[PDB]
């Protein structure tokens, strides 16, 4: 009902950056927010109708456009690292209720050099034998390391189907060097099954990591392979021993 033009962006400092919010619901009101740890949501800009815009609480560094009613464009004239954030748009109108409807969100990372973009390495770690005998359960661990930016989506697949029961992924990727602004990240996930399920050699367990990096409209002059948006996966097969 409310869409945003990108789910994940990585941009160099200085780049002009456009974020689009589009709603086909004929809503008069639209809003742009950013969200950061410790500050929550803050209003950047809003609009009560086509052709209107008013500075929100934190308008500096941003401008907007609303030349058409369906689209509220958020513009970063010259991206700076302090504009790395979760950007959320919303719309509303004067109805029986005045509640806002949020877009899905856009995670923008602003980096000083695109050279620091890296895809994750991904590995799957097999259940301990002592765990199986102590508890009669089997925990697999998926580990993704060395990625930048922290724009990843991890999923477990059992025999070709995505599963959710028995899964836990870290809510936060951890900086592999927290003091560092350009630190690469790591992320782990667990999937736990019964020992008899793991002990079936026909059972297939796949960890899949979707990583969002460079687009093809980005140039790359480096030796290593271009760190594009890609899926990296690892797997294990059940083991009777």
């Amino acid at each position: 009902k409310v869409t945003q033009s990108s789910r994940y962006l990585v941009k160099r400092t200085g780049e002009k950056v456009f974020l689009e919010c589009v709603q086909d619901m004929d809503h008069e009101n639209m809003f742009w927010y950013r969200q950061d740890p410790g500050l929550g949501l803050r209003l950047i800009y809003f609009s009560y109708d086509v052709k209107m815009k008013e500075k929100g609480d934190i308008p500096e560094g941003y401008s907007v456009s609303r030349e058409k009613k369906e689209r509220f464009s958020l513009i970063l004239a010259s991206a700076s690292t302090d504009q790395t954030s979760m950007y959320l748009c919303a719309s509303s109108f004067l109805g029986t209720g005045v509640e806002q409807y949020f877009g899905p969100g856009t995670r923008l990372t602003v980096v000083e050099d695109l050279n620091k973009v890296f895809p994750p390495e991904v590995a799957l770690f097999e259940p301990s034998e002592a765990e199986i005998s102590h508890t009669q359960k089997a925990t697999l661990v998926c580990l993704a390391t060395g990625f930048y930016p922290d724009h990843v989506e991890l999923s477990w697949w059992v025999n070709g189907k995505e599963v959710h029961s028995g899964v836990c992924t870290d809510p936060q990727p951890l900086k592999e060097q927290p003091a560092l602004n350009d630190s690469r990240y790591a992320l782990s996930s667990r999937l736990r099954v019964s020992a008899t399920f793991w002990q079936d050699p026909r059972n297939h367990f796949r960890c899949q990591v979707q990583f969002y990096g460079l687009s093809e409209a980005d140039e790359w002059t480096q030796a290593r392979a271009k760190p594009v948006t890609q899926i990296v996966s690892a797997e294990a097969w059940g083991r009777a021993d």
Partner: protein
């Protein structure tokens, strides 16, 4: 204008998780609560307009316009309730909203039979690489982040084996160190005295 209590709030499973939000404008007429899962977008869960309670399943919103506060109570909290909750209040007659800063709420599982253990797991593709798994400890255990630049320890994570009606906490540690053992990670984020610590086979 609009202020919410800070957080994060840790709530044991089965207890009431509660959030309070005060507002400055006595003439405010619309009050909203939003729920936002990690890395997703806020979704409206309750709106309330008059004094007293408003109930929806396990959610109760309460409004006290005389003392100027609105609250959200989550009854019989479960781990899956873990999220950021945000209050919002109208500030003009066009529909502009002011949001509170959001409060992170984490509901910890009720671990009736702790079996804390530290296990070493090996890579499916290479026996040479390993991770450590600290698991099955009760929810009062705290996993401290690494203090060594070369060791990595994750936050604890809650896993639900739905078919078994079984929940468990765990944390993961690893390193690229040659001499690195699992006890090097799990014992500054200290384990309890009854941890099962099998020697690696």
């Amino acid at each position: 204008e609009v202020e919410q209590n800070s957080g994060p709030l840790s709530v044991p499973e089965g207890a009431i998780a509660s959030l309070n939000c005060t507002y400055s404008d006595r003439g405010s007429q619309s009050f909203f609560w939003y729920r936002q899962y990690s890395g997703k977008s806020p979704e409206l869960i309750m709106s309330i307009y008059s004094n007293g309670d408003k109930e929806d399943g396990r959610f109760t919103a309460q409004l006290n316009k005389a003392s100027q506060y609105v609250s959200l109570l989550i009854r019989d909290a479960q781990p899956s309730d873990s999220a950021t909750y945000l209050c919002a209040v109208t500030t003009d007659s066009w529909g502009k909203l002011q949001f509170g800063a959001g409060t992170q709420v984490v509901v910890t599982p009720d671990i009736q039979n702790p079996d804390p253990a530290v296990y070493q797991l090996r890579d499916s593709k290479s026996s040479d690489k390993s991770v450590c798994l600290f698991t099955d400890f009760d929810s009062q255990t705290n996993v401290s982040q690494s203090k060594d630049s070369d060791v990595y320890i994750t936050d604890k994570c809650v896993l639900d084996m739905r078919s078994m009606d079984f929940k468990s906490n765990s944390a993961v540690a690893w390193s690229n160190k040659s001499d690195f053992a699992c006890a090097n990670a799990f014992n500054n984020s200290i384990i309890p005295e009854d941890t099962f610590f099998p020697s690696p086979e």
